[PDB]
Amino acid sequence: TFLPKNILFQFHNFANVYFLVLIILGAFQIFGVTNPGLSAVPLVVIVIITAIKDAIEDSRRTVPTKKSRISRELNFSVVINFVLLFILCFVSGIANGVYYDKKGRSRFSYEFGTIAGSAATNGFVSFWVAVILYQSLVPISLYISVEIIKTAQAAFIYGDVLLYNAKLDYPCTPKSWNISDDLGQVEYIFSDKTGTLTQNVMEFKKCTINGVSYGRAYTEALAGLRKRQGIDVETEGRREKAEIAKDRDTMIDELRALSGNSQFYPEEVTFVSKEFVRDLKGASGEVQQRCCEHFMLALALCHSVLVEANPDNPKKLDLKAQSPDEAALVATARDVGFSFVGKTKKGLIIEMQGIQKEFEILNILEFNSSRKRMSCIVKIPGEPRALLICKGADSIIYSRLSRQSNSEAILEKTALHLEQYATEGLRTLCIAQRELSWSEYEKWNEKYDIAAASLANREDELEVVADSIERELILLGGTAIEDRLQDGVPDCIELLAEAGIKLWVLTGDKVETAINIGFSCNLLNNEMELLVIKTTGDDVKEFGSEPSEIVDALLSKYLKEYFNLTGSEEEIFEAKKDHEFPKGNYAIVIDGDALKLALYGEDIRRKFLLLCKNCRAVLCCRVSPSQKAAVVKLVKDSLDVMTLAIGDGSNDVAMIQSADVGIGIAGEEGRQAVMCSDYAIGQFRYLARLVLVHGRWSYKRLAEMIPEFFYKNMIFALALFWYGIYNDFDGSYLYEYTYMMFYNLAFTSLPVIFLGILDQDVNDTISLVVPQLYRVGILRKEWNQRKFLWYMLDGLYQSIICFFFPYLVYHKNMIVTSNGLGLDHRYFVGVYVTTIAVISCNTYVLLHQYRWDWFSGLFIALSCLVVFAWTGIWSSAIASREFFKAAARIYGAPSFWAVFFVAVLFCLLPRFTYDSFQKFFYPTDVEIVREMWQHGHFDHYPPGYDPTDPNRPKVTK
Amino acid sequence: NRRPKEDAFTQQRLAAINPVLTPRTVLPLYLLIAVVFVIVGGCILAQNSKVDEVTIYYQDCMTNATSSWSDIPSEHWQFVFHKYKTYNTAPQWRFVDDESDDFTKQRGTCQIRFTTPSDMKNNVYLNYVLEKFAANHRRYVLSFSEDQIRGEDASYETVHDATGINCKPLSKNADGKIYYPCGLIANSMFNDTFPLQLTNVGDTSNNYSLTNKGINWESDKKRYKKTKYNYTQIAPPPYWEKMYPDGYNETNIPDIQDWEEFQNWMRPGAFDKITKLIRINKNDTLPAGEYQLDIGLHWPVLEFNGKKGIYLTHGSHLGGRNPFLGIVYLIGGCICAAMALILLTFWLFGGRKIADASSLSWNMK
Ligand SMILES: *[C@@H]1O[C@H](CO)[C@@H](O[C@@H]2O[C@H](CO)[C@@H](O[C@H]3O[C@H](CO)[C@@H](O)[C@H](O)[C@@H]3O)[C@H](O)[C@H]2NC(C)=O)[C@H](O)[C@H]1NC(C)=O
Ligand SMILES: *[C@@H]1O[C@H](CO)[C@@H](O[C@@H]2O[C@H](CO)[C@@H](O)[C@H](O)[C@H]2NC(C)=O)[C@H](O)[C@H]1NC(C)=O
Ligand SMILES: *[C@@H]1O[C@H](CO)[C@@H](O[C@@H]2O[C@H](CO)[C@@H](O)[C@H](O)[C@H]2NC(C)=O)[C@H](O)[C@H]1NC(C)=O
Ligand SMILES: *[C@@H]1O[C@H](CO)[C@@H](O)[C@H](O)[C@H]1NC(C)=O
Ligand SMILES: *[C@@H]1O[C@H](CO)[C@@H](O)[C@H](O)[C@H]1NC(C)=O
Ligand SMILES: [Mg+2]
C-alpha cells in the first residue's frame, strides 16, 4: 500500500521523469561522460524522503484535497525554469555543432577524432549531454522543500498555545497541512451566526406570566439598538449590569429565604426578575401566585429532557435534552424552585418547594420540525383530570385559539411583551393549557387510541386528530431565551476589519435583530451606512408589484447612488483586478427572499456581486444552507479571490467545503463541520490570532522562500553554462560530481528551508497590534511572477560573477599559486566557483531574512562551513581521482581568498545597495513598523498579547 | 490533556536580533568596506607591479629562425621588468636543424638568447605555455585509467570497459597489448626537451642551473605509483613510438612516480591557455645578463595554429603578474564609497523621519 502508489505518485511530475531519463541516459545509453552509480543519489534520496513524508501524511489522514494559489504560481515558475534550461541546452548543442564544423583544430591531431559529416549528429549528442550537464537547473528539491515548509508551518499552527482552548481541550488541529499560506491571503470571511459567533447555549431571560412581564437583562441586541441610536452604551451597560448583579444577588437571597431546595444551584440561574421573586410571595396576592405556579408547573412538565446524575456529585442532575431551548426552560423552572428529577414508568417526579410529587404523562405529541410544537397530556390526580399542555411559536399558538375561552385582556399585554422581546432580540415561545374533565377525557382518549390503532402512515390520522383537538387553547404566557456572543467576538471582528478583511455574517434571525447584533459585534459601527434590501411593503408598493424586481431596482439604486458605476461585465472585469480595502464605510443587509431572488438570475447576480465587492460588511438574514453555499461560490468562482468560511453544524459544512479555507468551530462533540473542514478552532475568537499571525507569516515565508530557491540553484547551474564558452560547449564538467549533487542536497538547502519555516518580519504582538500589515497579503504584493523574474536575473548576474572572477584570476598566465605549481585542472576552478557561489547564496538568504535568529544563523554558517569541510574531506581521500588535494592546494593560496572576498562583495553589492535605497527612500509598512519597534513604540505590550481576550489587562494606548 | 508544549521553539519566540538598517548604521559600514578594500587593492597593485616576467613564443622557430643568431620578431616575446619600463633589447634565436631525425614536422633545436636587466629573486620558475591546445573536451579529459595511474596491472577489461573514466579510443594495440599509459591524455604528452641549465653567454663559468625535481606537488606522489606490469603485456602509446621504437623491455618502462612532467601533463588545463611548470630553481638568484636556452623541438603545434613558448618568472603570492585582483578591489572599494556618498547626499537632501507612524500606507491616505 506504500511502495507502488508512492513511487508512482512521486514520478507523476516532470522533474522526476526528467531525472529518471538522466539516470537511464547515464547508465543504459552511456556516451562515456558520467559517474552513473552516484548520479542517481539526488533522485533516490528525494524519492525516499517524499515516500516517508507521504507515508506520515496518509497515516495522519487515517488516524477532496485543496491547493494554495502559490502552488499554481509555482507550476508556472517551474515551466519558465524548464524553458530556460531548454534554451541553454539548445545553445550548447548549436555551438558544439558549429564548432565540430571547423576543419583544423587540436582534435584532428591529438584526440583521434574525425570530421563527422553533417555535424548536426554531434550537435544532437551534445544537446543530450547538456541535458544531463545542466542537472541542477531542474528544480527537483523544490517540491519536497515546499512540502517540508508547509508541514512545519501547519505543525506550528497546531502546537501554538494561544489557540488551544482549555475548556474544550482542543488545540487548533489542522486537517489540511498545505494551505497555511492561503490562510495569509484571506479577503472574505463567511460566518454563520447562531453556532459560531454566539455560544450555542440558550439562557432563559424573561417571561410574561399572566400579562406580568418579569425579567430584567442587558442583551447584546439591546446594546446594539442603543449604540445605533447614539446613547453611550458603555455607561448605560455598566449601570444596567451593576444594577442587575445586585438584583441577582438579592434574588438568590430571597429565593434561599423562601424555601429549602435540594436541586438549587445559583451558578446556572439566569432569571433576573426581582419583581417576580417579590411577587411570588404576596405582592399581588393569590391569583398571580397561582398563575406563576401553574406556569412553572407546565414549563417543568411539558418537555422531553432526560436527566442523569452529575459525574461530580450524584445528587446534581445534568439535564440532557435534545434542543437547547427546552433545556433552558427546564433548568430555569428547576432553579426557580420547581425541579424535575427522575423518570418512572408512569409520568415524572417534580420537587416543588421541597416536596416530591409524581405525575402521569399519557400522550407526548413530540416536537417535529414540521409541527413546530410539542404537546403533552398529563393526568392530574386529586378525581384525576387531563391537562393538555402545548409549547410552540407565538403565531402557531395565536392561530389555534378558542372562540370564547380567551381573556383578550391579558392577551394584548402578553402580545406586547412578546413583540418587545422580539425587538430586544430574544427567541419567544408560547404555552397553552387545556383542562379536560373526566368524561370528555375518557371520550377523547378512546378516540385517540382508536385513531392511533390505524397503521400505514399513522402520521396523517395523528395530525388530523391533533388539528381537531388542539384548536381550543388557554394561553398562559410566553418565554424568552437569549444567545450570548462568544468571548472576544467584537474584538476579533474589529481586528479582522482593521486588517482589511471583508466580513459576511449569515444569520437565521430577523433583519432588525441581526442589525442590532451586528452593531453589538462591531461588524457594523456608527458612521457606517446600512444598505438594506428588505422586501417590505413600503418598498414593494413604491418600486413595483412583485418581488424579484424590487430587489433589482434596489440593487441598481444602491449602486448608482453610492458609487458611480452600474452592473456590467466590464465593471466585473475591472473590479476583479483591484483588492484595495474600500473607502466610504458602507454595509449591505439582505433578507432570505431577496438573496434568493438576487441569486436566481444572471444579471441580478452580477449586480449583487458588484455591490458586495465594496461594502466591507454584509449581513444576510434568514438564509438556507443552499444559499450559504451559493453565496460562497459566487464570491469565489467569479471575482477570483481567497475566501474563508467558518462555521459549525451540518449546513455550514456545505458552506465550508465550497471555499478556499474552511474553519470548523469545535463543540464538545466532534461534528461534521469540524471533520469536513480545513482547520478546526475552539472559539471564533481564535480566528483573529490564526488568520493574522500565522496567516501572514506563512504567506510571507513562502513568498520570499520560493524565488530564493529559484535563484540559488540557478547560480550554480549557470556557472557550468559559462564554462561551456571556454570548453567549446563540448560537455566536460566544471564541477566534481559530488559538488554537483551536494550543492542541492546539503550545501544550500537548509538556509532557504529555514527562511521558509522560521522567518518573522514582526513578532505576533506587533502583528496583532498593527493588523493593517495583513493588507499586503490581501493585495498580493509579496509574491508575483515579476519578483521571481527579478530573482532569476539576480541569479544570472551572480553566476556571471562567480564564474568570471576565478576565470579572470587565471586568464593571464594560469599560475595562481604562491609556489608556482599548477592548479589549472577544471575541478579546481570549479572549487573556486562553488565556494564563491555557496557563500554568496547563503549570505543573500541571510540579508533577505527579516529576523536573524540563532537557529537560522547557525545553519547558514554551517552550510558555508560544510562546503569547506566537504572539499577538505573528499580531497584528503585518495578515492577522489583528479581531485586529490584540492583543499590543501586551493585553500592555501592567497589568490583563492582574494578572489573569494571580492567576488562575494561584488555579488552582494547590487542587491544590498538596492535594498538600502529602498529602506531609505521608499520604505514599506513593515520597514516603518520595524523602525517604530526599534525606537521602542511597542515595549509596553507583553510578549504573548491577545487583544481579543476578556481576561487581559488593557494597555496605555 | 492536549495542551501544546510551551517552548521557546514551538511558539516561535527564539532569541534573535531584528536588524533594521538606518543610514546611521549602513553608511558607516559602506565607508568601512570602502576604506579597507581601497587599502587592500592599493597594496595588491603595488606588490604586484614589482613582478617581472619573460615570455617567448618559439613555435615559429623551424621556419623563421636561421642557422645564425637573429632578432626575435616583436610578436613572439613580451618582457615586463618594473625597474626598466622602457627596456626592449629584443632577444635572439637560432635554429639548429637535425637531418638525422625523420620527423620532418618538428625537429631540430631552437636556441634563444634573452637579456634580463634585473635579478629574479631566488625562486625562479620556467613554465612552458601552450595556446589553442584544446585539453578540455568531453572525450579527451576522461581518457585515462586511474587503475594504471595508481600502478595496478589492470587487464584489458578493467582498462577498457570501466566506467566514465576509461581509455576507450586508445585501449589496445594491434598485437594485443594494453597501452601502459593509455588514453588520449597520456598519449598526447608535450614532447619538447628543455635544458637543465641556462647557459651564460658572457661568463660561461657561472651557468644558471635548472632542475626537474620539484616542478609538481609532492602529494601527487601518493596518487601516482610505479607500475606492476610485465613489459610483455604493455606497449607505448601510438605517439610514444619514437621514444620507445622497440617497445618496453626490462629497463625502459617509464616510472611515472618520479616523472613529474608526466604528472603535470595528466592535469588537463581547464582553459585554452596551458601553463605547466617544467623547470625550477630554488637556490640561486638569476643575476642580470644574457642567457641562452636550448629547446629540442619535438611537439607539433603549427598543424592547428597553436603556440608553444617559455615563461620565466619569480612570481608573487597571488601567482604571476595579473592586475585583476588589485583593479577589482579598487573598483569595489570605490563603488562602495561612491554609493555611500550618494546615499548621504540623498539623505541630507530628502531624508524622511525614521519612526513616523504618519508615513504608514494607511495613516497617509
Ligand atoms: C613527441 O610527441 C609528438 C606528439 O604526438 C609525436 O608526434 C606523433 O608522432 C607519431 C609517430 O611517432 C605520428 O604517428 C603517425 O605519423 C604519420 C602521420 O600519420 C604516420 O605515417 C605514422 O605511421 C603514424 O601513424 C603522429 O602523427 C604524431 N603526432 C602529431 C600530432 O603529429 C612525436 O612522435 C613524439 N616524439 C618523441 C621523440 O617523443
Ligand atoms: C656552461 O654551459 C656551457 C654550455 O655550452 C658549457 O660550455 C661547453 O663546455 C663543454 C665542456 O665539456 C664544451 O665541450 C662545449 O664546447 C662548451 N659549449 C660552448 C657553447 O661553449 C660550459 O662548460 C658550462 N660551464 C661550466 C663551468 O661547466
Ligand atoms: C638546490 O640545492 C639543492 C640542495 O643542494 C639541490 O638538491 C639536490 O640536487 C642534487 C643534484 O644537484 C641531487 O642529487 C639531490 O638529490 C638533490 N637533493 C634534494 C634534497 O633536492 C638542487 O638540485 C639545487 N637546485 C638547483 C637548481 O641546482
Ligand atoms: C618572421 O616571421 C614573420 C611573420 O611571418 C615574417 O614576416 C618575417 O619575415 C620572418 N622573419 C624571418 C627572418 O624569417
Ligand atoms: C630497453 O629498451 C631501450 C629502448 O630505448 C633500449 O635502449 C635498451 O637497450 C633496452 N634494454 C635491454 C636490456 O634490451
Ligand atoms: Mg450554526
Numbering used by the authors:
A (entry chain A): 205 to 267, 539 to 857, 863 to 884, 887 to 1439
B (entry chain B): 50 to 414
Quote the paper.
Most P4 ATPases function as a heterodimeric complex: a catalytic α-subunit containing 10 transmembrane α-helices (TMHs) and a regulatory β-subunit of the Cdc50 (cell division cycle 50) protein family containing two TMHs. Dnf1 and Dnf2 share the same β-subunit, Lem3, and both are also capable of transporting PE and GlcCer. Here, we report the cryo-EM structures of Dnf1–Lem3 in three different states (E1, E1P-ADP, and E2P) and Dnf2–Lem3 in five different states (E1, E1-ATP, E1P-ADP, E2P, and E2P-transition).
There were Dnf1–Lem3 in the E1 (apo), E1P-ADP (AlF4−-ADP), and E2P (BeF3−) states; and Dnf2–Lem3 in the E1 (apo), E1-ATP (AMPPCP), E1P-ADP (ADP-AlF4−), E2P-transition (AlF4−), and E2P (BeF3−) states. By comparing the 3D maps of Dnf1–Lem3 and Dnf2–Lem3 in the E1, E1P-ADP, and E2P states, which were the three states observed for both flippases, we found that the structures were superimposable in all three states. In the E1 state, the A domain moves toward the membrane bilayer and becomes separated from the N domain. In the E1 state, the helix-turn-helix interacts with the P domain, specifically, its Lys-702 and Arg-703 interacting with the P domain Glu-994, Asn-998, and Asn-1008. Finally, the Dnf1 and Dnf2 switch back to the E1 state by auto-dephosphorylation. It is during this last transition that PL1 in the exoplasmic site is forced to flip and enter the cytosolic substrate site, replacing the resident PL2 there and leading to the release of PL2 from the flippases.
